Design a protein around this ligand. Structure first.
Ligand SMILES: NC(=O)c1ccc[n+]([C@@H]2O[C@H](COP(=O)([O-])OP(=O)([O-])OC[C@H]3O[C@@H](n4cnc5c(N)[nH+]cnc54)[C@H](O)[C@@H]3O)[C@@H](O)[C@H]2O)c1
Ligand SMILES: NC(=O)c1ccc[n+]([C@@H]2O[C@H](COP(=O)([O-])OP(=O)([O-])OC[C@H]3O[C@@H](n4cnc5c(N)[nH+]cnc54)[C@H](O)[C@@H]3O)[C@@H](O)[C@H]2O)c1
Ligand SMILES: OCc1c(F)c(F)c(F)c(F)c1F
Ligand SMILES: OCc1c(F)c(F)c(F)c(F)c1F
Ligand SMILES: [Zn+2]
Ligand SMILES: [Zn+2]
Ligand SMILES: [Zn+2]
Ligand SMILES: [Zn+2]
Lengths: 374, 374
């Protein structure tokens, strides 16, 4: 049995920014009240995890990153009611405490218990369950999935279908649900509309899937890497454009393509300039633009508010606007019911020990999602 | 017997920025095809008119300003079908051509024939109906209401109830419809919500009216002029705050007062800093902020897009999101049915000849709306 005991296991520890992950032994404490210790099965490499390494995102170091994953419950702390040992689960990087004003709000999903806005890199109780070489190691978004075992607060875990393929549905922990929800729930893309999607990685392909699902007539993919176009067309893009191919700003190209501006645009990269471009390419009176990409820490954009005064709507979301604990098991159920596909997002499947090579595939432009298997 | 003939009349010509208006004779050409010549009865002084004087709003000079008004049709050009001589009418500074992609969209109102985005200061045909001292004078937003007679394109005028009191209903041509629509149609304020309204002039008072109509529990007026508070309370503010009273920035004050941010915020001033503050003060995950105020020409704001990524929605609108020609007669009908009050906005009445004193009143902070009578 491991229950009630410290587990020594392998994890990918990030000791400082802009360095490879260190794959080594850590000690994982047993779960305290209302906590859940999970044996990881599969975790995806999300660009957000790369932002921690690059310093685009500031979070306390050293850290066990990873937030897109699935695993199997090893043990539960006293008080846990929503999962049990042996359950398949997906950690929730946006929690759902169910009691805060946001949780109670019918649209809101950015639960006030989150560790995103002012990251502490701890459990809800302000402490860490991880040590490495005698030192405490921070958690990341309450999840820390780049470990053979993690401990999460109950509000940061969802039970999923026992028959789920964990090496696919781990994507429901971030990339798929974020893109898909951004289209269907946040933007509320309409039938027959014209959509533009900036950034054709795992998240942007998922936005395309959502736009297609919502019945868009036109879905224009935008990326500087033309290698990403063929997959974007496979999942629903009607045409792809590379800004580098044009003498004019791409907002102008998109406005002409769409005969006056698009219905819905999505920034799915994380650049200040493309957030403004995305806003500008939506139709001035009724367009809607959604920010999905994570921008570099503490940097402001500049824009002209007349872009909004004419009628545009600008919004952003975390995790596709989904209330995380209610939505994740439904999304897995829908996948099992063949309502959407995940295979088009998966380009590479590596063992966990090859985490660094996975991140190099991302950084080189070669991968969409690499799934690491424990 | 004035039909088909040039009319000489007095108008208030603005020859140069930052100068008084010159009340002097102009010649008003007869209407061309699909144009309407209107004998003005009453016109309100809106801060946007003052923006033309200050250079906050750039539009070609010399100009006949004025956009918030009502009058009586003197004559119609060939092909006009929607009004007739002797009809009571409100000029529509935002037109409704009924044919463009915006006019056809269920939620758009910023008709593509507008003269607001890139002002020419002409009629739809690119020419002027106005001469003064033998010199052509520009139109403003297709309305030019600071004249005893104006000529407007048919898509820039609405027939209203023959029994309407024009010295009141002129406010439906801008200030009232704008603020009220901004709350009820653009923001879609909900029952029991907390609203914050930045700027307690005619438009922000109309926003308050709208929020109270929509059933908001709390409506916080924000103004640096505490003289504006009493009227704001009369029309529904539950509490008023002056930023100059506080050591902390007002977004933090509003966030505290609202136990984590308001449901709806409105910028009804026209400053870049208060556009950002107003966004910031709405709840980070599900707050909605609406820009109503008109910013200084060509200036950009600076903001941190993480304010959106958490879940905020930012939008703007012209004329409260109302499709102008459809809405104005319905708004007048509802006023006549006492569905809303216009008297709380009218603080001063003057003859047209005292237009400059009317502007002095607005500039001093003493008036809300001054109505000028021809
Ligand atoms: N809001 C959320 O909850 C949420 C969740 C998941 C991911 N993210 C963010 O979303 C963004 C995309 O994530 P991902 O899909 O995993 O990243 P990714 O796989 O790196 O994809 C980004 C795509 O953007 C492309 N790109 C880079 N620069 C430009 C440019 N100037 N113009 C057009 N394309 C460009 C690039 O070629 C790549 O295909 C990142 O910033 C993530 O941090 C946000
Ligand atoms: N979007 C539209 O269709 C539309 C329509 C009508 C009016 N407008 C604009 O809306 C704004 C309001 O117009 P109005 O109500 O006629 O103007 P107004 O009567 O000048 O009211 C503005 C109010 O803002 C207050 N104010 C000024 N500075 C600050 C500050 N820093 N903090 C708090 N309050 C401050 C000021 O004391 C005044 O009571 C102006 O910019 C207009 O041009 C927009
Ligand atoms: O990809 C999900 C994701 C985000 F959307 C963030 F805003 C963030 F800060 C983060 F760490 C993260 F993982
Ligand atoms: O007050 C209404 C109004 C506006 F909302 C504008 F954006 C504008 F440019 C203008 F001239 C105007 F009069
Ligand atoms: Zn919560
Ligand atoms: Zn992610
Ligand atoms: Zn139109
Ligand atoms: Zn106005």
């Amino acid at each position: 049995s491991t229950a009630g005991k410290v587990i020594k296991c392998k994890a990918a520890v990030l000791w400082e920014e802009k360095k490879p992950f260190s794959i080594e032994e850590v000690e994982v404490a047993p779960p305290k009240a209302h906590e859940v210790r999970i044996k990881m099965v599969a975790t995806g490499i999300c660009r957000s995890d790369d932002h921690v390494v690059s310093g685009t995102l500031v979070t306390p170091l050293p850290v066990i990153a990873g937030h897109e994953a699935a695993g199997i419950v090893e043990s539960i702390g006293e008080g846990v009611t929503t999962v049990r040992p042996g359950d398949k689960v997906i950690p929730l990087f946006t929690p759902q405490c169910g009691k805060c004003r946001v949780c109670k709000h019918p649209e809101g999903n950015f639960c006030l218990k989150n560790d995103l806005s002012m990251p502490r890199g701890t459990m809800q109780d302000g402490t860490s369950r991880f040590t490495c070489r005698g030192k405490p190691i921070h958690h990341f978004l309450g999840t820390s999935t780049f470990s053979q075992y993690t401990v999460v607060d109950e509000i940061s875990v969802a039970k999923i279908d026992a028959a789920s393929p964990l090496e696919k549905v781990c994507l429901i922990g971030c990339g798929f649900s974020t893109g898909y929800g951004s289209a269907v729930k946040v933007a509320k893309v309409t039938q027959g509309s014209t959509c533009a999607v900036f950034g054709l990685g795992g998240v942007g392909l998922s936005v395309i899937m959502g736009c297609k699902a919502a019945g868009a007539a036109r879905i224009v993919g935008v990326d500087i890497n033309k290698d990403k176009f063929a997959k974007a067309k496979e999942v629903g893009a009607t045409e792809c454009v590379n800004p580098q191919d044009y003498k004019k700003p791409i907002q102008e190209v998109l406005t002409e393509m769409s005969n006056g501006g698009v219905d819905f645009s999505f920034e799915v990269i994380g650049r200040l300039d493309t957030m403004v471009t995305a806003l500008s390419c939506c139709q001035e009176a009724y367009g809607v633009s959604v920010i999905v990409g994570v921008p570099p820490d503490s940097q402001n954009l500049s824009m002209n508010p007349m872009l909004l005064l004419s009628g545009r709507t600008w919004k952003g979301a975390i995790f596709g606007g989904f209330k995380s604990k209610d939505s994740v098991p439904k999304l897995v159920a829908d996948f099992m019911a063949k309502k959407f596909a995940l295979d088009p997002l998966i380009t590479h499947v590596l063992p966990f020990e090859k985490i660094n090579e996975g991140f190099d595939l991302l950084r080189s432009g070669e991968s969409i999602r690499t799934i690491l298997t424990f």
